[PDB]
Symmetry: D2
Subunit: 270 residues, 4 copies
């Protein structure tokens, strides 16, 4: 024979959560304090109660519990199991609707993408050869990428002297003679200044450009490269010249992972 | 130029779902006839896959020319602020489902524990039915043939008879206890069940589960009551409390021979 | 004390599946028939075995089982639970990879769609008014659609007399004066023949058409209607005229749900 | 005009993954020097999302100009012949997971059943520690302060003390059994545990589970051994067998006062 205190100890509840139940008539003790309040619980009530405080863990309304125990389904192992299979069935169908509504979210996650990437503004721009000074990337260097280079660069943003435009930053995509991906983040510089250490100097040659205004993120760049080289050029009517392409970050760029930013894409054309 | 029905013929839209939006301001013909325009329809296709996830008619109404009615950039992270919401709305269910899958744990024992053994003596008797890879079909085929057996003693009571052949081999017979001397239909057979004293356990539930009660009976249930299992002719016993091999709310008396 | 027969009875196995185990040394009886083969099992072996024939239900190799019981993890409730949580963890991560590879299947399920629907051939066609005879649909009739009308029509395909072309079938999309969706499946007929019962007669007026060659299914039609009215017209450079549009089924149509079929889409233009 | 590296710079492709395809025939420059072309790249983008689901290099090789290398119609039903395959490859796991979730059922009882009570008498003793919404943090804060307590009798043994206040209220103290007379650090307190005869149950597992053993002990475990529960000072007992409040492979002696 047990008390409200040790019962709350083995169920980890407030002793008034039981008084909460005691007054409801939901979990009444097997004995009354008919005078000075000696309230005593029987050790069989433990599982009669343990089922309640595991049905509550299913968000079953505490009032929905009591109506089961008035019809008797709460002290019946057969009737309780039936209800619990129904509530089980409703849960997985709540999952089913939502599992089928995210297959429907990733199917519009490629329909949002293909509206901009088609409805994309472009203009033709020609430029003479210029000089970009900064640090470089290697498509084979273990443990590095575009987010990593622009991470360790921007602290050294001030070092470049002779900047041609402080608000304009370049991300160049050329190669080594082995076709390796030679990336350089840097600034257009006036031609007569010291190259810092350990920074490099890349000469972008004179090229004719198709300038596409990206709207999105830096990981959204590689796939917008695809549409341009794969299909958007022949659409627009122009031809890919082999040379040096680069992204063009501007005042209108407000973060690598901010989708409301923009990036200009300079691809060589004829 | 598109007319009010022509805005409806494109897809599965009612003629009033538009004037539904007119008084609101969610979408209005540009200019008592009313007019319609070319990419005024992208304004309505995005809404669809948004209403195909039940965005409120008022949620959109701000979401319109606040931005982004038109910016396809804010609605890409927005949509993953809703792939976020939904996939956690799912994950919530999983632990609920998982913890139910484990609340379904204690179910077996509150039943098995509350499974008492009644001791029953049955004089020898004879049952005719079908004899034997799966005992499931053995019932599937026999239940329609069930009115070919004459002289039934109680037609509601079928017997799932498991004989203990000495090899041992599985002998199983499903039939009805019948007065002797009646004829046996071809493809049926008359099994004679010897007189035995049984331990009778009422199993509550489902035909593939009853193996559970069997292991419970033979591991510890018989021991707890002092009874000694006896190799012989056990049988499953069915009556009005049997409502299918898959209904968790039906009862099957298991008849276990003892000494 | 039990035997191989009743043990197989309570586990629903072949009696040689136990002999299979008996020879392996995996489930040896607690006693030998040291002479005439009296093989006897103890009732405690039931759960010692019940764990095996529930681990087999997890496709755990029967040889992987035995090596657990040589190291002792099979008769230990603590060590078995640890292994079972690891195998649990691997299962959900098998789910995780595949649950994440179908969000990746429904994301390309809109990228496959937007290649054709952009790379879509079209030509301009002008036609005088003709007559189509068949049965009609109603966008408000309870329990009906395009699959249902073409279902109950094709059996009555022979009844139409005066056919202009037996291989060509039309699916018309006009209204009632209330903007309701008035669909008619039918055939182009020579103008002087009896209208069957209960079939109707729709006069398609003289119109200028943008003819788009659908590739897909009948449910793939409504969304190809979208791209045309929504964006593909201004792309192509022409204007939507209000009137009567229809699908055009041909020799090159090989089934409503056969994706390798084609359908010509006639939309009124200027 | 695109060069061999230029076919690689577009995406995350090695300079040899192409010549990988050259000898095969899966993709070859039209005419070490070799040449490249404009929608020869769609021929390679579809492959990606096909290799992003690991289609065999030889499966594709037929799938190419057999059809459909180019027909975007066969590869839409094909892809759902693989949404089919994968979503059943998942569903298979679920029943395995679900039936494991229910194989995890019988786990509790094979443990609880095999939980014996040792009867232990402890002369009165004193423990100093921290006193008390959640007893989880009560340990989280105290474990670093654990070397401020001087005069420890055994430093590996911590005590989770639950006093039975008459109201009743939750009194809980987490500390170390210490020789009396040493000083008590501020924000700690010295609890005196009376002399009691205990029933000691070794619990195998995890701090949020131990409520399980508590209900098992107080519902039927104490009865089965004739012992009478006694309101008093119970305490959880930790030692080298305790490896965290979430590790299912650690042991916690529960100390239950009896008559």
């Amino acid at each position: 024979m047990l008390t409200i205190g040790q019962l709350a100890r083995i169920f980890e509840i407030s002793t008034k959560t039981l008084r909460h139940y005691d007054a409801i008539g939901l979990f009444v003790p097997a004995r009354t304090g008919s005078d000075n309040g000696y309230r005593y619980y029987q050790p069989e009530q433990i599982e009669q109660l343990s089922r309640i405080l595991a049905l509550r863990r299913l968000d079953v309304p505490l009032e929905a519990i009591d109506r089961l125990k008035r019809d008797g389904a709460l002290d019946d192992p057969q009737r309780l199991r039936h209800f619990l299979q129904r509530h089980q069935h409703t849960l997985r169908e709540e999952i089913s609707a939502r599992q089928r509504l995210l297959a429907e979210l990733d199917r519009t996650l490629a329909t949002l993408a293909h509206w901009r990437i088609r409805n994309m503004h472009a203009r033709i721009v020609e430029r003479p050869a210029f000089s970009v000074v900064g640090m470089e990337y290697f498509g084979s260097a273990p443990g590095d990428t575009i987010g990593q280079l622009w991470e360790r660069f921007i602290p050294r943003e001030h070092e470049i002297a002779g900047k041609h435009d402080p608000e304009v930053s370049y991300g160049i995509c050329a190669q080594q003679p082995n076709g390796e991906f030679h990336y350089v983040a840097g600034f257009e510089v006036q031609e007569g200044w010291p190259v810092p250490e350990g920074m490099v100097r890349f000469q972008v040659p004179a090229q004719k450009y198709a300038v596409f205004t990206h709207k999105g993120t830096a990981p959204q760049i590689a796939e917008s490269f695809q549409a341009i080289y794969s299909h958007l050029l022949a659409e627009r009517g122009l031809e890919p010249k082999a040379g040096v392409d680069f992204e063009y970050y501007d005042q209108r760029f407000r973060g690598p992972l901010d989708p409301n930013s923009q990036v200009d894409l300079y691809i060589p054309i004829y």
